[PDB]
Design a protein around this ligand. Structure first.
Ligand SMILES: *[C@@H]1O[C@H](CO)[C@@H](O[C@@H]2O[C@H](CO)[C@@H](O)[C@H](O)[C@H]2NC(C)=O)[C@H](O)[C@H]1NC(C)=O
Ligand SMILES: CC(=O)Nc1nnc(S(N)(=O)=O)s1
Ligand SMILES: [Zn+2]
Length: 259
């Protein structure tokens, strides 16, 4: 009943226990830039005050599938069809050995990791769950991460505290910090398209936005992420790695680019 990225209950058998995962518009996908359709009318994505997370501690949790961070309802994502509000944010990465841990690809190439910022249509619904199964109910920002030659102070707000939640279900609080700083500096270039959640139930309720520019973290940081979290509640511990879903069929969906 507890699904996993691989194994007997890997992303291959998801469609069985969660039919929706076999939908006609799943995510992530391999974004082929040659098929990308330019749309000069796509308004700039703009995170209103994502450096203003207030005063109260943010919740840093360990699913067993990822590291998730809570976000204040004060973060408002503009530039989209409806008004969205930030709810949570989490990461995806590969195992120690590999350097491919992102969920989306660009022209068949994946990066070291991926950041996902989840929003919901608070304009039309009252909860994140409510919009999780409503058309266009969710909106996710996808930031691809590469290994840089320098330590990223932004990402440390999260990485520096990974030991506090080494085991699954372990929780903790962090001093609020500028989320904005976790995105690439230039957000003009991006791709948009209709998709789904990348984990069961795989609800096809999300409006995706994947940035063209990438964010960077030191090989040290990427390592501290790969080799620190366990996917179990206690010992024996089992490395929570390779937590990304494979590119899904495009099923003839159009993918727009702002550039
Ligand atoms: C995501 O899917 C929705 C619905 O399938 C698309 O909405 C339609 O968009 C076209 C052109 O933009 C309009 O003429 C239709 O009226 C829209 N349908 C309605 C009323 O929802 C939307 O364009 C898709 N988003 C993208 C660009 O991927
Ligand atoms: C309840 C909820 O928000 N679930 C999500 N499941 N997968 C998500 S992801 N990886 O597409 O951002 S969000
Ligand atoms: Zn995700």
């Amino acid at each position: 009943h507890h699904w996993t990225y691989e194994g007997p209950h890997g992303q291959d058998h998801w469609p069985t226990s969660y039919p929706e995962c076999g939908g006609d518009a799943q995510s992530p996908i391999n974004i082929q830039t040659d098929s990308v359709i330019f749309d000069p009318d796509l308004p700039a994505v703009q995170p209103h005050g994502y450096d203003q997370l207030g005063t109260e501690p943010l919740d840093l949790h360990n699913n067993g599938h990822t590291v998730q961070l809570s976000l204040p309802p004060t973060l408002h994502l503009g530039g989209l069809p409806r008004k969205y509000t930030a709810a949570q944010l989490h990461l995806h990465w590969g195992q120690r050995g590999s350097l491919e841990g992102s969920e989306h690809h660009i022209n068949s190439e994946a990066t070291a990791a991926e950041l996902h910022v989840v929003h919901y249509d608070s304009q039309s619904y009252s909860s994140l769950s409510e919009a999780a199964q409503k058309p266009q109910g969710l909106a996710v920002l996808g930031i691809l991460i590469e290994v840089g030659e320098t330590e990223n102070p932004a990402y440390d707000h999260i990485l520096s505290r990974l030991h506090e939640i080494r085991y699954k279900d372990q929780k903790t609080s962090v001093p609020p910090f500028s989320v904005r700083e976790l995105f690439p500096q230039q957000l003009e270039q991006f791709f948009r398209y209709n998709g789904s959640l990348t984990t069961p139930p795989c609800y096809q309720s999300v409006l995706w936005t994947v940035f063209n520019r990438r964010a960077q973290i030191s090989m040290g940081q990427l390592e501290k992420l790969q080799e620190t979290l366990s996917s179990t509640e206690e010992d024996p511990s089992e490395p929570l790695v390779q937590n990304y879903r494979v590119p899904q069929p495009l099923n003839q969906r159009t993918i727009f680019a702002s550039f």
